[PDB]
Every structure is written in structure tokens, then in C-alpha cells.
Write a protein that binds this ligand. Structure first.
Ligand code: JJS
Ligand SMILES: *[C@@H]1O[C@H](CO[C@@H]2O[C@@H](C)[C@@H](O)[C@@H](O)[C@@H]2O)[C@@H](O)[C@H](O)[C@H]1NC(C)=O
Ligand SMILES: *[C@@H]1O[C@H](CO[C@@H]2O[C@@H](C)[C@@H](O)[C@@H](O)[C@@H]2O)[C@@H](O)[C@H](O)[C@H]1NC(C)=O
Ligand code: NAG
Length: 216
């Protein structure tokens, strides 16, 4: 996140760090004790057997006993199309179930098909780059839903009056709007925090029947 701020430790207990040999590479969201969801592009060229799913994290540079660590048992995809930047979503089934507590919680999702209007206020978040290295402390950022320079196949957001946005490493992280996970961070244009192109997220509301079919 560029131009954001530190989150309060464990403010967003559904927030997940996907890691390889102890290094964060993508965010994800806990959607049931045994399932996370992320961006399809996070795992496209990654061997998932090596992925560690880290729950209950805040500061990635510190040893944290609030953490729970899982491996990926199964992947569910939904037609990820990198040529057209579409369906940038994957569900990772864990090799066991999270222990739900103060530091690890299941996120609430929107109704199937729910659109967000121009001007909706959301929080983006993640451990991605802080300037246009990766964040130690989880960052969050106030963003505004926009339709200009967006397609109906994304939820896009823009910070006005300054350059701020998601960045590399924020891939797969949730966008929270009106208390529900409405987005998964998908792509930028014009580099991070251009102040021109809105950030694009996979529109989670469009995938809700699909999600529900998998997680129960
Ligand atoms: C392949 C890849 O690694 C890509 C990355 C990280 N990003 C990217 C860069 C910075 C931030 C983000 C974020 F939005 F956070 F997901 C994504 C692209 O903008 N472009 C790439 C990209 C990402 C997603 C999709 C889709 N659909 N197509 C291309
Ligand atoms: C589920 O997985 C946990 C973490 O597994 C570790 O990371 C993965 C990516 C592999 O490299 C693996 O060799 C590591 O052990 C385990 O600690 C935990 O026991 C597992 N839970 C089960 C099997 O119920
Ligand atoms: C900045 O955002 C703060 C938190 O956002 C609210 O709660 C999150 C989890 C989402 O549900 C989001 O849709 C909500 O807006 C707000 O408390 C604060 O008002 C925001 N400030 C401005 C100026 O946008
Ligand atoms: C989750 C959160 O922090 N939401 C706050 C809300 O409680 C408050 O009424 C408003 C004030 O502007 O900002 C937003």
C-alpha cells in the first residue's frame, strides 16, 4: 500500500499472508475455517505445494504466536483469463481448519450480484510495497469506488487529491466496503499510485454463488 497507514494490530482478523520460504508474496481472505480466497494471478506460476497460508499475522518481521500456519490442500479456480484480466479469483482449501479467535476470523461476503455505486467508501489493505520494500506492518488505505477507466468486470477504486493506492505484494488482498469483502486486489495501471488509473479488484459479489457452492 502506497500512502496508506499502519493498521491497528489484528483490526482485520480475516486478513491472510500467503508466503513462500517465510516470505510474503500475496494477501488472501479467510472465508471459512478451511478456505481462503485470493487472486488467481498470485498462484498462476507458483507451485502451491510450497505455499504457506499464514493467519493471525500483523508484523511480518516479528515472531508472532497469534499466527496459525496452513498448507494448501486443493485449489478451486473460476476461469482466470490473464489475456482479458478477468476472473482473477481462486479459492485455496487448507490442510486443516483455522481456530477462530480474536486474531483469526471469517470475513462476511456480499449478496450475489451486488454492485457498488460511484462514491462508495472502502478500505484497501495489505503488506505490499510502501512506495511507487514490502511493509512490515499491515497497511490500510481509504479508497473510493469509481467507474471511470473501469470495466463492469471489476470493482475499481481511486484516492483523490493525492497519489495513493495498492502496490506489488497487495495482490490477492481484500477490499472491504460497507463491512463486506467486495474486492480482491487484481491489477494496477500506470504503476502504483499513479493518481490517474483506478486500482482494479476482482468483483467478489459476482462470484458469491460460486464461493458458497465450495465453502458450504
Ligand atoms: C501478473 C502480475 O503479477 C501482475 C501484478 C502483480 N499486477 C499488480 C501490481 C501491483 C498491484 C496489484 C494489485 F492490485 F494489488 F493486485 C497487481 C499487475 O498490475 N499486473 C499483473 C496482473 C495482475 C492481475 C491480472 C489479472 N487479471 N493480470 C495481470
Ligand atoms: C497443515 O500444514 C502445516 C504447515 O505445513 C508446512 O508448510 C507446508 C507448505 C509444507 O512445506 C510442510 O512440509 C510444512 O510442514 C502443518 O504444520 C500442519 O501439521 C498441517 N495440518 C494437518 C496436516 O492437519
Ligand atoms: C476511512 O475509512 C474508515 C473505515 O472504513 C469503514 O469501515 C471499513 C471496514 C469499510 O467497511 C468501509 O466501507 C467503511 O467506510 C471510515 O471509518 C472513515 O470514515 C473513512 N474516512 C473517509 C474520509 O473516507
Ligand atoms: C469501521 C469504522 O471505523 N467505521 C467508521 C464509523 O464507525 C464512523 O461512524 C465513521 C465516522 O466518519 O467512520 C467510519
Amino acid at each position: 500500500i502506497v500512502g496508506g497507514r499502519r493498521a491497528r494490530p489484528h483490526a482485520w482478523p480475516f486478513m491472510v499472508s500467503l508466503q513462500l520460504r517465510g516470505g510474503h508474496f500475496c494477501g488472501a481472505t479467510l472465508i471459512a475455517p478451511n478456505f481462503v480466497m485470493s487472486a488467481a494471478h498470485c498462484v498462476a506460476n507458483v507451485n502451491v505445494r510450497a505455499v504457506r497460508v499464514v493467519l493471525g499475522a500483523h508484523n511480518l518481521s516479528r515472531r508472532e504466536p497469534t499466527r496459525q500456519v496452513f498448507a494448501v490442500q486443493r485449489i478451486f479456480e473460476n476461469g482466470y483469463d490473464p489475456v482479458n484480466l478477468l476472473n482473477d479469483i481462486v479459492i485455496l482449501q487448507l490442510n486443516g481448519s483455522a481456530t477462530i479467535n480474536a486474531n483469526v476470523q471469517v470475513a462476511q461476503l456480499p449478496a450475489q450480484g451486488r454492485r457498488l455505486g460511484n462514491g462508495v467508501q472502502c478500505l484497501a489493505m495489505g503488506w505490499g510495497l510502501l512506495g511507487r520494500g514490502i511493509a512490515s506492518v499491515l497497511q490500510e488505505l481509504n479508497v473510493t469506488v469509481v467507474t471511470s477507466l473501469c470495466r463492469r468486470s471489476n470493482v475499481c477504486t481511486l484516492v483523490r487529491g493525492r497519489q495513493a493506492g495498492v502496490c506489488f505484494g497487495d495482490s490477492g488482498s481484500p477490499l472491504v466496503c460497507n463491512g463486506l469483502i467486495h474486492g480482491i486486489a487484481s491489477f494496477v495501471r500506470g504503476g502504483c499510485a499513479s493518481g490517474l488509473y483506478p486500482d482494479a479488484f476482482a468483483p467478489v459479489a459476482q462470484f458469491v454463488n460460486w464461493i458458497d457452492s465450495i465453502i458450504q
